[PDB]
C-alpha cells in the first residue's frame, strides 16, 4: 500500500462510427466569422406536365417556380472542466498528460450521443414493430428495399445495429448450405460481411436509448393542418392537433415517437405512384420533435418532422396519395412506456456535421488536442489564490438536416 | 476531413499552441513477387539480353 | 511557495556547460567531411566503371 505503479490501469471504451458515416463534405469551413450563426443550402426543383391534343395553345395554365432552403446551425458547448490542487495532481502526474486520455474520449462520446439523439429525433421513416428484435435476414434487407423503393439513387446507404443483434445474424449465417468462405468466417470470427442484404451493416455499442412515454385512447385529428409547399418549403416540419386522447397526463408524447397515419400512403417520389409492400400498402409516418403534454379534453398540439405535402395548386411537390383532413384515424407505434435502444438506417445525404474552431483566449495559456479529426481547445488558469487551478476543454459542433425523408428507425417484425 | 496519426510522443513537458499540424506517414513494404522475364537473343551487339 | 498571500516562484538560473564538447565534435566533423568512394578491382575495365 506504499509502492504504486505509474501506469494507469486500462478502462472501458466506446466506439465512433456515426460521425464517420455521416456527411462531412458539404458543410466544412462554411460557418466562418462572415457567414453568421446559420447557413443555408438550396433544394431541387420538380415539374408537372399537361395532357391536351392541340398545338396552337400558347396560352394556358403554366407551372410555377418555388425555391426551397435547408438551414444548418450551431449547437451548445461540449465543456469539461476540473478544479483541483496542483500539488496533489503533480505528486504523480507531471504536465497533466494523464488526465488527457479519459477527457477527449468523454468529449467525443458525448458528441456522438448528441448526434444519435438528433438523427433519431429528425428521422421520418419507420419500419417494423419496436418490440421485436432483429433475428433474420429480411429484417435488415427490408431497409435497403424500402430505400430503393422510395427512389434515392445518388449517395450510399448505411445501417447501424447493437452487438447482440449482429451475433444473431452471424449465428444464422453459420447455418448456410454452400458458401464455405462465409460459413468458416462466421464460425471462427463471428463477423458478418460488409454488404449484408444490399446495405452496409455496422455494429456499434454506443447508441442512444429512449423511452416511449405513456399514452392511451384512440387518437384522431381535430383540425385540418396546412401542409402546402409554400408553408413547408423551408423546414419540412408541421404542427398538428390531436383529440380523443387521455384526460390529463404529463409527458403524453416524448421526443422521437412515431405517429402513423393509417389511410395516407407513401408515394414513389419521381413517378408519383403509391407504394405496395407486397401484401399491403405502406402508410405515412412522422416523428415527434418536442415533448408534448395533454390538457383537459385530450387536446395535444404536437410538432412533427416530415410533411405530407398535398398542394392543390402545385401538384408537382406531392408526396402522399391523399390529403389528411379532420376525422382521420392515427396511431402511435410501440407500447405504452417501454425503454428501447433503436436501430438506425440512413442515406449518406441525410444529416451533416461540422465543427467551429475557437480562437485562443487572451492572456491565458492554452493548447489544442486532435482526436478523430476533432480539435479540442484547452485553457488553463489560476483564478483564486488557494492552489485552485482550473482547466477547461471546449469544442463546438454544428448540425444540419437535409431531407427528413431519407432515414429513420427500424426494428424486427413478427 | 483531416485525421492524423496519434502517438502522444511530445507535449511531454512542452506547451503547445499550433493547431495547424497533421501527422502523415509514409509506409514501406518489401514483397517477394513472381515475375516473368523475356530473353532477347539478338546476335548483333551482344547476344544474351535478359 | 505560498509566501505571505502570493505565489512567488523559485529562481531558476541556467549556466550551460555541456555544449562546448558537442560543438567541438560537430566542428571536427564539419572540418573533415567524408563521402562514398568506389574502389576498382583486378579487371581491365573496373577502373573506368568505378570512375
How far is Cα A119 from Cα A18, in angstroms, rounded to an integer? 10
Number of other residues whose CB lies within 10 A of the CB of residue A214 = 15
How far is Cα A185 from Cα A329, in angstroms, rounded to an integer? 49
Q: What are the grid coordinates assigned to A400, written together?
A: 444540419
Q: Is B49 helix (H, G, I), strand (E, B) or coil?
A: strand
Number of other residues whose CB lies within 10 A of the CB of residue A256 = 21
Q: What are the grid coordinates assigned to A357, written together?
A: 474552431
Measure A211 CA to nearest chain B CA, in Å: 34
Q: What are the grid coordinates assigned to C38, written together?
A: 568506389
Chain B environment of A97 (Cβ under 8 Å): 8, 11-12
**CA A36 to the chain's CA centroid:** 25
Q: What are the grid coordinates assigned to A288, written together?
A: 415527434
Sheet (strand A389-394) strand order: A80-84, A389-394, A374-381, A366-371
How far is Cα A9 from Cα A111, in angstroms, rounded to an integer? 25
Q: What are the grid coordinates assigned to A117, written together?
A: 439523439
Tell how strand A157-161 and strand A343-347 pair up.
antiparallel
* Secondary structure, 3-state, chain A: CCCCCCCCCCCCCCCCCHHHHCECCCCCCCCCCCCCCEEEEECCCCCCCCCCCCCCCCCCCCCCCCCCEEEEEECCCCCEEEEECHHHHHCCCCCCCCCCHHHHHHHHHHHHHHHHHHHHHHCCEEECCCCCCCCCCHHHHHHHHHHHHHCCCCCCEEEEECHHHHHHHHHHHHCCCCCHHHHHHHHHCCCCCCEECCEEEEECCCCCCEECCCCCCCCEECCCCCCCHHHHCCCCEEEEEEECCCCCCCCCECCCCEEEEEEEEEEECCCCEECECCCCECEEEEEECCCECCECCCEEEEEEECCCCCCCCCHHHCCECCCCCCCCEEEECCCCCCEECCEEEEECCCEEEEECCCCCCCCCCEEEEEECCEEEEEEEECCCCCCCEEEEEECCEEEEECCCCCEEEECCCC
> Please, what's the b/e burial string for A351-387 (b: 16 or more CB within 10 A of its CB; e: otherwise)?
bbbbbeebeeeeeeebbbbbbbebbbbbbeeeeeeee
Shortest CB distance from B13 goes to which of A94, A100, A365?
A: A94
Tell how strand A343-347 and strand A300-305 pair up.
unpaired
Residue A281 has phi, psi (to 5 degrees) of -65, 150
Shortest CB distance from A367 goes to which of B3, B8, B15?
A: B15
Q: Is C31 helix (H, G, I), strand (E, B) or coil?
A: helix
Query: Would the CB atoms of A360 and B17 count as touching at under 8 Å?
Result: yes
Sheet (strand A407-410) strand order: A125-127, A407-410, A343-347, A157-161, A199-203, A195-196
Subunits touching C (CB < 8 Å, at least 3 pairs)?
A: A
> Please, what's the b/e burial string for A285-307 (b: 16 or more CB within 10 A of its CB; e: otherwise)?
bbbbbeebebeeebebebebbbb
Measure A284 CA to nearest chain B CA, in Å: 36
Contact call for residues A267 and A289 (beta carbons, < 8 A): no
Interface test with B, best of A6, A26, A29, A95 (most B CBs within 10 A): A95
By the 10 Å C-beta count (0-12 exposed, 13-18 middle, 19+ buried), C38 is classed as: exposed
Query: Would the CB atoms of B19 and A357 count as touching at under 8 Å?
Result: yes
Sequence-distant (≥ 6) Cβ neighbours of residue A108 within 8 angstroms: A16, A19, A371, A372, A374
Give resolution in angstroms: 3.7
Contact call for residues A77 and A396 (beta carbons, < 8 A): yes
How far is Cα A63 from Cα A316, in angstroms, rounded to an integer? 9
Number of other residues whose CB lies within 10 A of the CB of residue A117 = 14
Amino acid at each position: 500500500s506504499q509502492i504504486v505503479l505509474k501506469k494507469f490501469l486500462p478502462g472501458f471504451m466506446s466506439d465512433l462510427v456515426l460521425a464517420k458515416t455521416v456527411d462531412r463534405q458539404l458543410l466544412a469551413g462554411e460557418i466562418n466569422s462572415s457567414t453568421g450563426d446559420s447557413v443555408s443550402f438550396k433544394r431541387p426543383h420538380q415539374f408537372s406536365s399537361l395532357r391536351t391534343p392541340t398545338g396552337d395553345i400558347s396560352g394556358q395554365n403554366k407551372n410555377n417556380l418555388i425555391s426551397g432552403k435547408a438551414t444548418g446551425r450551431v449547437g451548445n458547448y461540449i465543456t469539461v472542466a476540473v478544479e483541483y490542487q496542483q500539488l496533489e495532481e503533480a505528486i504523480k502526474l507531471n504536465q497533466l498528460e494523464e488526465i488527457l486520455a479519459p477527457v477527449r474520449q468523454r468529449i467525443v462520446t458525448d458528441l456522438e450521443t448528441e448526434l444519435a439523439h438528433f438523427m433519431m429525433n429528425n428521422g421520418a421513416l419507420s419500419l417494423g414493430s419496436p418490440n421485436t428484435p432483429i433475428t433474420k435476414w429480411s429484417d435488415v434487407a427490408q431497409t435497403a428495399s424500402f430505400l430503393k423503393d422510395l427512389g434515392v439513387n445518388e449517395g450510399e446507404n448505411y445501417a447501424v445495429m447493437d452487438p447482440w443483434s449482429a451475433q444473431r445474424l452471424a449465428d444464422a449465417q453459420t447455418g448456410l448450405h454452400a458458401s464455405d468462405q462465409l460459413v468458416r468466417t462466421a464460425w471462427e470470427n463471428a463477423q458478418i460481411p460488409t454488404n449484408f442484404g444490399g446495405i452496409r451493416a455496422l455494429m456499434s455499442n454506443g447508441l442512444a436509448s429512449r423511452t416511449q412515454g405513456a399514452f392511451g385512447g384512440t387518437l384522431t385529428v381535430k383540425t385540418q393542418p396546412t401542409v402546402t409547399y409554400n408553408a413547408v418549403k423551408d423546414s419540412y416540419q408541421f404542427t398538428v392537433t390531436l383529440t380523443g386522447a387521455t384526460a390529463s397526463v404529463t409527458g403524453f408524447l416524448k421526443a422521437g415517437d412515431q405517429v402513423k397515419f393509417t389511410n395516407t400512403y407513401w408515394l414513389q417520389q419521381q413517378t408519383k405512384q403509391a407504394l405496395y409492400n407486397g401484401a399491403t400498402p405502406i402508410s405515412f409516418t412522422a416523428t415527434v420533435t418536442a415533448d408534448a403534454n395533454s390538457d383537459s379534453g385530450g387536446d395535444v398540439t404536437v410538432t412533427l418532422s416530415g410533411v405530407p405535402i398535398y398542394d392543390t395548386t402545385n401538384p408537382q411537390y406531392n408526396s402522399v396519395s391523399r390529403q389528411v383532413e379532420a376525422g382521420d384515424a392515427v396511431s402511435v407505434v410501440g407500447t405504452a412506456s417501454q425503454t428501447m435502444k433503436p436501430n438506425l438506417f440512413y442515406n449518406k445525404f441525410f444529416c451533416g456535421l461540422g465543427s467551429i474552431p475557437l480562437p485562443k483566449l487572451h492572456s491565458i495559456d492554452s493548447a489544442v488536442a486532435t482526436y478523430e479529426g476533432f480539435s479540442i481547445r484547452v485553457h488553463k488558469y489560476a483564478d483564486g489564490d488557494a492552489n485552485v487551478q482550473k482547466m477547461r476543454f471546449d469544442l463546438l459542433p454544428a448540425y444540419v438536416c437535409f431531407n427528413p425523408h431519407m432515414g429513420g428507425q427500424f426494428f424486427g417484425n413478427p | 476531413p483531416t485525421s492524423l496519426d496519434v502517438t502522444s510522443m511530445t507535449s511531454w513537458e512542452y506547451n503547445w499552441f499550433g493547431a495547424d499540424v497533421i501527422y502523415i506517414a509514409k509506409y514501406y513494404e518489401v514483397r517477394k513477387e513472381s515475375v516473368d522475364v523475356i530473353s532477347y537473343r539478338h546476335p548483333i551487339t551482344g547476344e544474351i539480353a535478359t | 511557495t505560498k509566501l505571505d498571500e502570493q505565489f512567488e516562484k523559485y529562481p531558476k538560473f541556467e549556466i550551460n556547460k555541456v555544449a562546448t564538447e558537442l560543438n567541438r565534435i560537430i566542428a571536427e566533423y564539419r572540418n573533415n567531411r567524408i563521402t562514398v568512394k568506389f574502389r576498382p578491382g583486378d579487371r581491365e575495365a573496373s577502373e573506368e566503371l568505378a570512375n
